From Swiss-Prot:
It comes from Cryphonectria parasitica (Chestnut blight fungus). The chain holds residues 90 to 419 of 419 of the full protein. It comes from the Eukaryota. GO terms for biological process: proteolysis. The active site is at residues 35, 199. Its EC number is 3.4.23.22. This is Endothiapepsin. The keyword Disulfide bond applies. Keywords: Aspartyl protease, Disulfide bond, Hydrolase, Protease, Signal, Zymogen.
Length: 330
């Protein structure tokens, strides 16, 4: 089997991408944030505290003839940005782009933190990291991809995120028309539960490529590119008027600037992030200070190849017995 679903930016800045997901019988379609940095499939629901729902579409398990309470199971997650959610668990049928999994754990939110409430466009998350990170207790549950894997034509999914445009998540096949050149594959460590890999270096604009190992994670659920303060300082030094504000939350630049590209290495291959992908617009409405899309990871504990980096590439998440990552230009 295979699946192919379109993923759409939630706003004009590509802050996140939403993908329609059919849950239950008859289907209830919710728009979920596919997140290769986590491993829970959780949804706003009829059980979510009413004051914490503000425009999201909810899953109502009592209206699904295939829903079953997973007795005794609870979940609770905290994300790197400080947001969180928790609740109980049902199993139900879940389909993505025509690919159907029966008995998928659907984690129903009883509580969500304010950032989720305040974003009416995201109805939940669909985690695509390794199932060892799934938070369901006392019996850990499998991700949608782990459940689907054995049925797929090939044990892979691909992320093809658009710049200010829709893109595609495919399951079970590699669309050879979706990228240029070849796909370069690179080793993955699953020791932390992430799609963790090592970039071979970087360049700023037309500058020379610096060969240096940069360990990090491929994370579709993080908006920006978070890298070593050294690498990040080298990039912002090429933009006139750039400064790092503790008060705003990182590097900002004058909105009148033209940003240079940023290149990262994948083995001997190179992925070029155009300068325009690094512009996240005014810090507040009407400001002439703009927020940068490349930021320091120094306070995170890990480097994160988030959407800014991933949307410059066609990315293969190869879930074979020894997982690997693939990157191609497009
Ligand atoms: O081509 C693979 C597909 C993409 N979306 C599909 N559907 C199936 C019907 O329910 C809406 C979603 S099939």
């Amino acid at each position: 089997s295979t699946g192919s679903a379109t993923t759409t930016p939630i706003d004009s800045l590509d802050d996140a991408y939403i993908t329609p997901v059919q849950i239950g019988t008859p289907a209830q379609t919710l728009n979920l944030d596919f997140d290769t940095g986590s491993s829970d499939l959780w949804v706003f629901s009829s059980e979510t505290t009413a004051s914490e729902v503000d425009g999201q579409t909810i899953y109502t398990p009592s209206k699904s003839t295939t829903a079953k309470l997973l007795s005794g199971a609870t979940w609770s997650i905290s994300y790197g940005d400080g947001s969180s959610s928790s609740g109980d668990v049902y199993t139900d049928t879940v389909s993505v782009g025509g690919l159907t999994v029966t008995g998928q754990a659907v984690e129903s939110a009883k509580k969500v933190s304010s950032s989720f409430t305040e974003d009416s466009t995201i109805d939940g998350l669909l985690g695509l990291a390794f199932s060892t990170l799934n938070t369901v207790s006392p019996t850990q549950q499998k991700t949608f991809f782990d459940n689907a894997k054995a049925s797929l034509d090939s044990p892979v999914f691909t992320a093809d995120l658009g710049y200010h445009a829709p893109g595609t998540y495919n399951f079970g096949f590699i669309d050879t028309t979706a990228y240029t050149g070849s796909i370069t594959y690179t080793a993955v460590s699953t020791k932390q539960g992430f799609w963790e890999w090592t970039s071979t270096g970087y360049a700023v604009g037309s500058g020379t490529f610096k060969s240096t190992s940069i360990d990090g994670i491929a994370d579709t659920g993080t908006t920006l590119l978070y890298l070593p303060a050294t690498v990040v300082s080298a990039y912002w030094a090429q933009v006139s008027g750039a400064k790092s504000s503790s008060s705003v939350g990182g590097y900002v630049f004058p909105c009148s600037a033209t940003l240079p590209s940023f290149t990262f290495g994948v083995g001997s291959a190179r992925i070029v992030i155009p300068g325009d992908y690094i512009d996240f617009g005014p810090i507040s409405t009407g400001s002439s200070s703009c927020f940068g899309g490349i930021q320091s990871s120094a306070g995170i504990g890990i480097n994160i190849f988030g959407d800014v980096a991933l949307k410059a590439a066609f990315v293969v998440f190869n879930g074979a017995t020894t997982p690997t990552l693939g990157f191609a230009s497009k």
